[PDB]
Ligand binder design. Structure first.
Ligand SMILES: O=C1CC(=O)NC(=O)N1
Ligand SMILES: O=C1CC(=O)NC(=O)N1
Ligand SMILES: O=C1CC(=O)NC(=O)N1
Ligand SMILES: [Ca+2]
Ligand SMILES: [Ca+2]
Ligand SMILES: [Ca+2]
Ligand SMILES: [Ca+2]
Ligand SMILES: [Cl-]
Ligand SMILES: [Cl-]
Ligand code: NA
Lengths: 363, 360, 362, 362
């Protein structure tokens, strides 16, 4: 009959903590068969050797499989699990659970929160960071939009993607088959996978025309970017998982989403603009926030507003960790709550050194 | 009659003196009138940070050849307070304080005073001996500042020592124990004892509440203007009192507030207001912002857990510095501001003082 | 008559069960006979290492499926001790202990024997204090009985997993009006390791009870066990104990020997432990099943009079460095970096050293 | 006739000149005869390591004061090669090379010889490319001549300091319309080390010019020098070269020998290098002046087929781990962790290995 999306931002005590989700299920507030996606901030280092991502997904899949009476593999085929590691600074570990009910109510007036999920095919290692990944992500984004019943791409406000990376073993597999990979480095492969996936969002939503995107442009032409894409790499899967979040004229949700783009890592004005775009027009209305979701990164210039920083020169602390700490702190200082989603590495996600920022709010 | 000028100078590396050299060579700074240099250096700000000493040595070399005197005499004349750790987007820079005596014709204006303490025994670090001696030099520096009312003191910056392996062996040889065995934790004890010395001198807390057992344990005791930073390269405390005096002709003033926690942007705006900055348009009057940052002992901020105290890969003082610099930068639009970590007895638990120096 | 078999298995990731599954599916391991798994997992080996729990969860879920029982029942039945930190060239792997009942002839001298025991859960304010010492000592005695070892001189390695403090657990303690032994999460690992190690020494008669008190724990480094190997983690709230030795009631084709490294570069002690396990020449290194060792930074900040920065390095915690060093030393003697090295050797060997054991085919 | 003396001096900090000053004040070192100082400094050895420059500044300032000349003049006369990173048990120290002409007899056989040479400054876009290879090769040949070595087989170690790319230098290159060899500050160290190492192999005839191109640099690991040892730093724009060998025109009471570690745990190569320097037994190890070696993670992510995480670890860069490992292996053979080990051995020995030299008293 009618889609109603509910979104639950749940604090976690550890990567494997399912207790807060279990409390909401046991109280009857969440039917677990209606969960379509879980977006996590997990407290590993968010870089190459972060096993909290897989630990969290495994723990959630185990739990939901037992509650639903189905196998873990069926849960993973059915539910998007997107775990973004790295909870630096004051950023609070948490999960955001997306529930899509089917209700016997009319659509609410105007446009209200809508979500769609789609998975791509698995990618061969030589496809990561290249047009194959761009075009297949674009196709899956369009599918998720239709799943969400969103017709106008301007009504898409955040497209969250989990994407793969290259391990030593996967690079060697490509080599044994006579293929080369986009880069022979696991950490850099995360940027290429994030960037190709983001360009696929831009292609699908019409933010960039197809004839401007080529292999040569991926992670090189920073004038090309999506204003709503948010992509995050991990070792666990070989495909991309996509969540499209926007507003539909055919939704019964009591929530809406809005967004802006941070021009740089300290752009508090963009945080306030994203809040306003989600209907939050004053500090007292900040209690309507469900979550804030943003991309952060170290600008390629090595500077912010003309001031040097060491992020790209610091050999002890990877720059994606520093970028996450900074943007989480900036958002937290505006909204008064560090339990917000910030992910690092914003290739083709907002301008160089900036990133999209979206707000899910109660109406 | 004293006048104080303050110069915030970006640096390209710990040993970079070129920005200071440009201002001297252009006549805008007379090196003989420099009384203190407060630096943010790009080492890790913890135990094995050698950018502090590298920066001090490079500056001492340079000012010695420019003043015709020896390096050793320069360090006895000028306070060098190098705070390592430039995490996040925090920009390495130095802040140079110039104090020139100029006869001139109301209103309170920036005044600065310096005072070195005697050298401390390692057994005295983090204990009442350090507290009482620091309180002495603060009043001494209050004097050089020509400031009579402690309510006119807005920031008290201190470089304090730490306990090395050999300084522990020394107290061991001499038959005396030290406040703690961990060299990293001695930084917190030296920082906290020094801070209590400021609260004691300024009458922020009465002396009968301060004991050895209260140091780094009773967080109800704290100064609202103290800012202390530890390093390996000395054994005494170097104190800079900054405030406003009627007997001053400076074109600057200093205000301050206290960050209740690491994301307290309201306190940043209050500090700006206390220094005469009332709108975003007037932000260009900032000379520098100076703040203390730290991880709260509860492991939380506004009820939300974070990993700073559980993260074995990144020391919590590094994270706290990144966070508070990003918050201040997002208010003033400029990450080149002074943030130092470890705020023991400096503002409440999880918070710290924040001061703004601004043109009038 | 018990027969112990030990399988050292390379792993591709913390959750990799494929090597164990291959041995089960080939018929080489009956999963019902597994009594303990000792892992090296590739997290940072410090407070915020979740690879330890990820590995245990993955193994318990796999074995639970294979055996037709719940995960909870598997973790009550099988010791899972995951030591994080695979720095330097140290290769991630698990060592699986299988114990079966057999009818076999007697008097094979003494051969490898294994026993397992668990303590109760500890409150945060008990870590690093006599309650942990005494509970561990009782469990060590139980594990010895499980191993059918009555003579403590026949115990060659006592491997323990023990808890640690997080900021959240310290705050729980404060809310209940209790003070923890130390207010630093990393240092809490040393107190839990040290108290657990002194519990081994108490149980084996290496130190008399009247010499152990709260004040001595992590302060009197001349108190130590020569066989204790303890390892701390966020993923458990009790201690798990594996006693490994030799007994006359054993039909194993394996034996264990040990020595004590006096410092982190004591290759002589590696060769002495090999010899105590019956490996008398480089030509016989192929009989190694695994080498198990403790490593640590010396409190003096030195090795043979030479300074190092392990205790002063704010970027890399000293147990990470000690593991890389001692693994490299062992690897250079035996020609294989896939050996067990655990860092932080409080009351485990002298200050700056630690026990080292070798499991070898006869 | 040239006489070379070499003093290995422990340091308490990067700026510690006291051990050197002791040797000068007692008359054992004439400061005007110092031609090079090779240091291990206790920074992280990567991009943001300022202990290297801090050490050089302190040494240049001290020597300029002793010789009555300017800092500028000292750095033009003396090679200062500070290699950061003292991980594991590796002990910070400096190795001071003293060379003087003498009127003395010969030939007592071949004895230690040293020569020094500097290259021009490099643009950022020349690092890791043939401009650096060829100019380094030119300078190695010059340093050979300064050492009075005509036979490349008598060169046993070629130590080099070379530049790296910072974010600001990469951005500047971009503004000038020039792309650099790699857009990554950490990886730029590998390209500078590797191009410099190939310069050595070219100068010494270890590899034909035919085989070297931009495309081969940090790609064809079959190309390598067996004596090159290179180390990158943020504190200079050129390459500084120290050639160390033996020649018939030497009156030193020292010799150098070398081998090549095939991998990070090749203790046999350590003993081979000792033997090549005349140290035939454990009893003769008191003749060591220093051991100098290159260490690295193999591009395969393995040692003798065993996986490690050095290339995967986002918390600790692999050159830090490699240094800890190889220093520990050497220390366990010679009983002393105060030896020189530098990380990143691109085109320096085979993939995963590196050269190792020993300077010994005859
Ligand atoms: O923030 C991020 C970005 C990514 O690519 N992968 C993560 O785990 N965390
Ligand atoms: O921020 C800080 C605090 C300290 O104690 N020492 C430093 O170098 N930086
Ligand atoms: O070991 C090393 C290698 C390098 O490239 N740079 C350093 O400072 N140390
Ligand atoms: Ca971007
Ligand atoms: Ca405070
Ligand atoms: Ca020990
Ligand atoms: Ca090599
Ligand atoms: Cl209800
Ligand atoms: Cl864990
Ligand atoms: Na799991």
């Amino acid at each position: 009959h009618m889609q109603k999306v509910e979104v639950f931002r749940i604090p976690t005590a550890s990567p494997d903590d399912i207790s807060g989700l279990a409390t909401l299920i046991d109280s009857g507030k969440i039917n677990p068969a209606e969960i379509v996606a879980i977006l996590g901030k997990t407290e590993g280092n968010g870089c190459v050797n972060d096993f909290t991502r897989g630990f969290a997904t495994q723990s959630l899949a185990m739990y939901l499989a037992e509650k639903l009476g189905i196998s873990r593999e069926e849960v993973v085929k059915k539910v998007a699990f997107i775990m973004s590691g790295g909870t630096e600074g004051v950023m609070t570990p948490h999960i955001t659970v997306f529930v899509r009910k089917d209700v016997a109510a009319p659509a609410a007036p105007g446009k209200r929160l809508a979500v769609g999920v789609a998975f791509t095919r698995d990618f061969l290692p030589e496809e990561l960071g290249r047009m194959e990944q761009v075009n297949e992500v674009a196709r899956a984004v369009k599918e998720a939009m239709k799943d969400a019943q969103i017709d106008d791409p301007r009504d898409v406000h955040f497209v969250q993607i989990k994407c793969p990376l290259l391990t030593a073993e996967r690079i060697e597999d490509a080599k044994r088959r006579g293929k080369d990979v986009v880069v022979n480095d696991t950490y850099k492969s995360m940027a290429y996978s994030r960037g190709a996936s983001a360009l696929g969002v831009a292609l699908a939503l019409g933010e960039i025309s197809a004839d401007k995107i080529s292999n040569e442009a991926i992670c090189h032409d920073w004038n090309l970017y999506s204003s709503v894409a948010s992509t995050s790499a991990g070792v666990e899967l070989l495909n991309d998982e996509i969540i499209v979040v926007g507003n539909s004229t055919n939704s019964a949700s009591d929530l809406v989403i809005g967004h802006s783009v941070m021009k740089d890592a300290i752009d508090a004005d963009a945080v306030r603009a994203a809040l306003k775009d989600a209907g939050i027009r004053s500090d007292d209305e900040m209690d309507r926030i469900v979550n804030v979701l943003a991309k952060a990164e170290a600008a390629s210039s090595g500077t912010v507003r003309g001031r040097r920083n060491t992020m790209l020169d610091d050999s002890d602390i990877n720059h994606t960790r520093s970028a996450r700490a900074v943007v989480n702190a900036v958002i937290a200082s505006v909204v008064g709550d560090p339990m917000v989603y910030v992910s690092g590495g914003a290739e083709h996600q907002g301008p160089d050194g900036g990133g999209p920022i979206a707000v899910i709010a109660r109406v």
